[PDB]
Point group: C2
Chain length 350, copies 2
């Protein structure tokens, strides 16, 4: 009687062609498009694509009716109906929806994608009214999140807020409320929006309310790189290119293993203490979310990931300089961690 999403074997990721084009884009609400080009029976390349293709048919199965559309676009055949779609570089997974095209960076894995797609499908702004609502919003701490108080769903400034929201889906969170009490509690004024940078207590208030679409958007583009940020799988790839200065100050910490949890609660202090520093952005990778990679990192970095760590790694010529506290050592604290971060240049360009 069915049971469990164990792949069917079936074929749901069809290929776009100028033939079907018409009727595919106007058959589906969201349409997920993976642009590629596969070389001969270069079994490596065939095996490398076969993974991606399988992931998509399993995502396609999980979300069969929900109505997203899963297609394939080749770069040697169908290369003009691809530039007549926008697709500037091979291998990427695009999604067309509020008609726009979200670029999906992030691990190519079916569970990730399903969550991704199942967020684009919902609308950009989540509205709050109750205590479990306001409390579940007050819960998110590791995602950027903007909340704004408005008059109505038809508030012309609310409508600017939802339009700004679209430019950032699924990755950033916009929420609104119309209820007066909720806003008393969350300390918002009328048409005012508060910006919560992750792992800081305080929300910075977006200045000089009411705001324009383009003002809200400018701000979220200004404040988009938090002082400490989590390496989430939704966007793992996007944050690994958002280079701070050529490097990444990376910090590992398992937030269950109590040396790691503890190491984290220090990490947020340096983060709260050095917010307005432009040049300091810490990516925290909880090793428990990245198995595959834990092995790879542990070995190309010359550290023990089953312990806490924080170092500098250059995004280009692959070497790292870890605060290996060089025996191994068991410490730190903020004053000691800031000073080593502050000193990364003595451990660099002198």
């Amino acid at each position: 009687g069915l049971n469990f999403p164990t792949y069917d074997g079936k074929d749901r990721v069809v290929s776009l062609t100028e033939k079907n084009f018409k009727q595919v884009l106007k058959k589906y609400d969201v349409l997920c498009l993976y642009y590629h080009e596969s070389v001969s029976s270069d079994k490596v390349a065939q095996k490398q694509f076969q993974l991606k293709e399988i992931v998509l048919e399993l995502v396609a199965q999980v979300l069969e009716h929900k109505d997203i559309g899963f297609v394939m676009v080749d770069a040697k055949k169908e290369a003009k109906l691809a530039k007549k779609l926008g697709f500037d570089e091979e291998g990427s997974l695009y999604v067309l929806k509020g008609d726009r095209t979200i670029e999906f960076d992030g691990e190519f894995a079916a569970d990730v994608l399903v969550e991704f797609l199942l967020d684009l499908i919902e609308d950009p702004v989540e509205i709050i009214n109750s205590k479990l609502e306001v409390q579940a919003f007050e819960r998110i701490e590791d995602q950027i999140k903007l909340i704004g108080f408005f008059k109505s769903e038809e508030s012309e400034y609310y409508k600017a807020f939802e339009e700004a929201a679209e430019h950032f889906q699924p990755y950033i969170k916009f929420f609104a409320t119309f209820d007066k009490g909720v806003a008393k509690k969350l300390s918002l004024k009328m048409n005012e929006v508060d910006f919560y940078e992750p792992f800081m207590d305080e929300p910075i208030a977006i200045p000089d309310k009411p705001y324009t679409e383009e003002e809200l958007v400018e701000f979220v583009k200004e404040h988009q790189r938090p002082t400490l940020r989590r390496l989430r799988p939704e966007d793992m790839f996007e944050t690994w290119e958002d280079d701070l200065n050529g490097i990444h100050i990376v910090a590992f910490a398992e937030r269950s293993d109590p040396d790691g949890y503890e190491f984290l609660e220090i990490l947020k202090q340096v983060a709260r203490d050095n917010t307005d520093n432009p040049d300091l952005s810490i990516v925290w990778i909880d090793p428990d979310d990245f198995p595959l990679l834990v092995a790879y990192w542990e070995k190309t970095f010359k550290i023990d990931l089953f312990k806490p760590q924080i170092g500098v790694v250059n995004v280009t010529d692959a070497d790292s300089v870890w605060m290996e506290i060089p025996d191994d050592d068991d410490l730190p604290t903020a004053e000691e961690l800031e000073d080593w971060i502050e000193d990364v240049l003595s451990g660099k360009i002198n």
Copy 2:
């Protein structure tokens, strides 16, 4: 292909034949075997095998630096070997550590399998050398654990605990201490073992002090069904196949959705009371642990898994029954719960 890493298309899982059976056996510590059907008789049954194949090719890539061998054995071309290896269930992933053959009845994913295998390459009895380490021994609530005080490794009573331990890897955790100080904290007389069932308050001592391998294997088997068993990805299937007379009293509750926490805590206390009840075995499923499945269950289970819930999903006839449609957000008492279960359990469900 350039990211941080992906899957190199290369071919690591290799086919097992008698021509090389000796050579690879006396070559790896763990051998991981996929016992499959045949080649291609009907194509969309070769798509599913490519799911099962592309995963094993990725697991093998990550765990390359490990002493694990990934091999496939064909039920048709090699029926000599499968008979000597003891493989009869086509479609199965078996691993071989020593003279023990371990079947994987879990969610066939590359992350689940990297977890499973790493936990299997490990030594089966975990030694607690210090009071300190005891506090972490007591962390584990949702898994069956056994601890024993033995005079040392060298003793026949540890020897044959270690042997009982390998029958059950990696599903049931076995620990051991040889410090008198740790023993007095856990309360074990010399050569005394304790069985800790998930979610209960005290242990069950294993009774006729001391034991042999098959005296221990017989007690675990005898008490290895918990009243509140947590559904896990590493053994999910194995759990669903073990019914409690056709049905399954299934319970949803997200452990961090605070209601889910509070509902789980009353689930544990009804289970703590009716622990005595032999038909009763509640499977709780943290929905945040099963994404693709929350979508599956998002068509047939019309129910709302963001909320608490509990009911009788019938394995045999594909249907399902849930807790009351009066039952609102009004979260039950321990008392109300039992009360729901006994005329379901005993009487017609309704």
